[PDB]
Structure formats: C-alpha cells, structure tokens
Amino acid sequence: NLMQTLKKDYRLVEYLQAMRNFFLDTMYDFYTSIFDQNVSFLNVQLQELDGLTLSYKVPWPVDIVISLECQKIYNQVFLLLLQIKWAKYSLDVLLQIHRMFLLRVKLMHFVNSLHNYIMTRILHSTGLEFQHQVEEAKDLDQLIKIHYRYLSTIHDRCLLREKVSFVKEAIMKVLNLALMFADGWSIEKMESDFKNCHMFLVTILNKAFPHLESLALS
C-alpha cells in the first residue's frame, strides 16, 4: 500500500530514483556554465579544484534509509565524476604544427575510454541490478542492506577507497596532463612524460580485483 501511494502523491522508492538521477540531459548544462567561484551564483544556475559539496532534503519516512553518512558517499562519486566530464569536455570543445593533433588522439582517446568504463560498465551495470532488486523489497531492514550493498560496492569498483597512492594517484596525475595541454593552444617533453606515465599506468595496473581487466586493454 505504501509503495502504491508513493508512485504519485511517503514514496521513499520514488525519491531514491530521483536521487541517483539529478547526478551521475540536465546536469550537462550545469557543469558547462562552470567551465567558463561564488557560492550564490551556482544556486541560481543549479535551480535553472575539488570542492562543490552537494546535499539534499529527505523527509523523515525516508531519512532512515538515506542516512547522513550516505550523503557523503553519493557526494564522493559525484566529485570524481565531474573531473572526468571536465577533462572529456575540455579536450572536446576545441577543434610540427599538426603534430599536436597526434597528441590529441593519443590522449582524447584515453580519457574517453576511462569515461566509457566508469559510467557504462559500473555506474550502469550495478544500477540496472539495483532497481531489479528494490522492486522486490519485503522488509524494513533488508532494504537498507540491499542499498548499503550498492554504495560500498560502487565505491570499490570505482577505485576511490584504498590503493589510492598506489593506483588511483596515477590516473590523478595523468589527469593533470589534460589540464596543462588544454591551456596551451616543451611539446616534445610531453610525450616523454605521456609515454612514461601511460606505460607507468599499465605496468602498475598489470597486477590484476579482476574487473579491472575491462579497461586494461587501453
């Protein structure tokens, strides 16, 4: 009965679907304005390097499900996702002279491949399974568990919890190449770095726990 009157009209399930939707279209126009700050400027933009803490308002009937320490994890993946959209869009909005373009495809590929991995293979695989699971909710408690077994696993596949200075930092430092090369628009000294860090990336990730091979091809 509760779920029935919650599709229209304390629909906890309806609120949950919107949650993972207003981040992870609409949010495309939002970030593009940030590319070209102030704390009130953003709000009117939203209502229309690593910060932007986002929160939301949840009614008591669903407060027990979407806890307070649950907001931060949902915020954690949102921060990292934007940096990927940033590098992906920064190298995309523009259009030994032509030699720079060979450094573009050699790079615009790599960030693009990673983005195809986090969103599709992870942020849409477990998402498709999670919805098929919540529709069979039969308990107050287990609905927390099926939910808590969705964040603590999506925070592991997306490598953000541990092995950060061992693996995650590598993707982080090469992301700085997406910033440096974007502004300039020394060239030889980039591929010496790029061919090194990229090989550093594969020769480190080569230890593969098993799901990392879906990107290890490149």
Partner: protein, 342 residues
C-alpha cells in the same frame, strides 16, 4: 474520541443556534441506532456525523452565496484587508496624510474615519451594505499614527464560527505590513515625478542614480505579492468548490492564512529585520529631496552621502541572505544579472 471530530460537532451546533424537511427524522433514527450497538466503533461514529456536518454546511453555503450575495465575504476580505482594492488606499493616503504623521491623539480616531468614508465615495464605489462594517481603530494609550493603525470587521452571525477574533487578528497584522510598503512606494513615486518636473547641478544626478536604485528594491519587493496573494487565494477558492465537507474549509482556510505569515517573509526575523530598515531609510531620502526647492547645498549633499554608505551595504547584505521560496524573489531581482557584480 479525536479532537478533529470534536471540531465538527461544535460547528454543527453553533450553526443551528445562530440560525434560530426530511433532514430531521433520518438523523434521529441514526442517533438511536448507535445506542443499540453493544460496541462503540469510532469508525462508525464519524460515519454519521460527517454527513450531518456536510448537510448543514451545504444548505448554509446556499444561503451564504446565492440569496445573500461565504465566497462573497471572502472577496470583500481580499479587497479591504489584503489591499485588493489598492486604488482606494492610495487616495485614502493622499487625504489622510497630514492627519497621521503627527503622534496620534484621542481625536484622530474619528478624524480619519470621515476621510476613509469620503474615499470610497471618491472612486464612485457606493454601497450602504458592507461599508459601515469597516471601522478603523487607533491603538491609543496602551510614535507615528501608522504604527497604531488597524482595521476591524464586524462579522455576521453564521460566519462567526469561522471568523474568531484570533483569525481576524492575524489578518490585522498582515494589513499593517502591506499598508506600510504601499505607503513608501507612493511617496517614492512622487519623488520620481519631482525629478521629471525639474527638467531644465553636477551632483543633481546622484539623486536619481540612488532613487531609481532604491526604487527597484521596493517595487520588486512589492511584486511577488500578486504572485503570492493571487496564487494562494486561487487555491483556497478551489479547495471549497471541490470538497463537500466542512472540516476541509476549516483546515484549508487555516492553512491558507498560515502561508501568508511565512511566504510574505514576515515570520522570518532576518528578512523581516533587513528590509525593515529600507522602509524608514527611504522616508528620510524622499523627505529630504522634497523639503527643499533648490539643490542640496547647505549640508544636504553632505547628508545624502550618509544613507548611500548604509543602503548600498544593505543591498549586498540581502544578496547574501538569499544566497524554499526566495528563488521566486531572487529570480526577478537577478534576471538582469546586475547584483552578480556587487
């Protein structure tokens, strides 16, 4: 027994006492049938009372509208209490202006009632009905006159169950705040007509560069009011024409008024304490420019430079207060993206 159904009972009884076919015997037998049930089931006690409430309310709604021209009284309320007939109150201010700026005394109570009565006849609005029901009061001996002005309404008998002196009290508070902003915009518009009249000093432009600035802070503050009055009123007028129950009216109307205290930024102290300073600060400005016929030379320009040092800060101060419903106010204030520079 829940307190809700207790509110239903008292209404049906008072509505017949004040009132002094087939709807009588049927209610008797139902009351008697309940006494034979060896179990008092609360789900059934309400099942018969809710029909009786909706029965006397339906017939009363007929007498309150069709023969006697609840909706009609509500329209009168929205007019005079909520400044619905705003044109009447600008001519009322034009006449009852000098007899209110001085501190109020025991005679100004009646000195203004003849002005208000003269105001309704001044806009050819003539009705011996509903005119003597509005008697302006002055809270005297327990300060400018506007700080004690009030408007009372003598409710009829059938509507006394819905209009207690308490609900007519919260209405009175709104009438004071809405009349205040309507007063400052009027005298401010007169200043606009004073600069335009003075078409042919280098410092003479500093007035309108601040006047037109201080005009948008009040005019837009005076907007969002038709977008909160003519909108909430559109819902309350809908809630009655949909439900046949009387309890719905007593809660929807009580809910309708509660929004006016919140949406109109009255209960929230900070927004109520910030724009409050814009009111009396503007009084000094419009008075200063009207208190002279030439340029502000003898320390007048030395006085204008004092308010701008306070007002311009308050402009950015409210900009920080904004950054639930303030978007409906900030959208109009920043559609031109000027406050982004402050």
């Amino acid at each position: 027994i829940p307190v809700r159904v207790a509110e239903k009972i008292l209404f049906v009884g008072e509505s017949v006492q004040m009132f002094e076919k087939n709807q009588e015997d049927t209610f008797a037998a139902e009351l008697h049938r309940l006494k034979q049930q060896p179990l008092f089931s609360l789900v059934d006690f309400e099942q018969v009372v809710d029909r009786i409430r909706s029965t006397v309310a339906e017939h009363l709604w007929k007498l309150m509208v069709e023969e006697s021209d609840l909706l009609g009284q509500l329209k009168i309320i929205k007019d005079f209490y909520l400044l619905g007939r705003g044109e009447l109150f600008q001519a009322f201010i034009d006449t009852a202006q000098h007899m209110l700026k001085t501190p109020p005394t025991a005679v100004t109570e009646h000195d203004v009632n003849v002005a208000f009565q003269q105001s309704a006849h001044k806009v050819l609005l003539d009705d011996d009905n509903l005119l003597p029901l509005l008697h302006l009061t002055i809270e005297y001996h327990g300060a400018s006159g506007w700080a004690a002005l009030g408007l009372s309404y003598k409710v009829q008998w059938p509507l006394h169950i819905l209009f207690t002196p308490a609900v007519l009290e919260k209405y009175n508070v709104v009438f004071k705040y809405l009349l205040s902003v309507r007063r400052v915009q009027a005298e401010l518009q007169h200043c606009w007509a004073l600069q335009m009249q003075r078409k042919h000093q280098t410092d003479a432009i500093k007035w309108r560069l601040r006047n037109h600035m201080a005009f948008l802070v009040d005019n837009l503050q005076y907007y969002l009011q038709v977008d909160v009055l003519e909108s909430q009123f559109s819902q309350l007028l809908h809630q009655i024409n949909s439900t046949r129950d009387f309890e719905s009216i007593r809660l929807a109307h009580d809910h309708f008024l509660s929004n006016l205290l919140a949406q109109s930024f009255i209960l929230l102290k900070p927004v109520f304490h910030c724009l409050n300073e814009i009111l009396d600060l503007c009084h000094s400005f419009c008075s200063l420019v009207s208190q002279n016929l030439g340029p502000l030379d003898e320390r007048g320009a030395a006085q204008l430079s004092i308010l701008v040092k306070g007002f311009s800060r308050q402009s950015s101060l409210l900009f920080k207060i904004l950054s639930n419903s303030d978007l409906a106010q900030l959208l109009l204030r920043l559609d031109y993206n000027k406050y982004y520079t402050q």
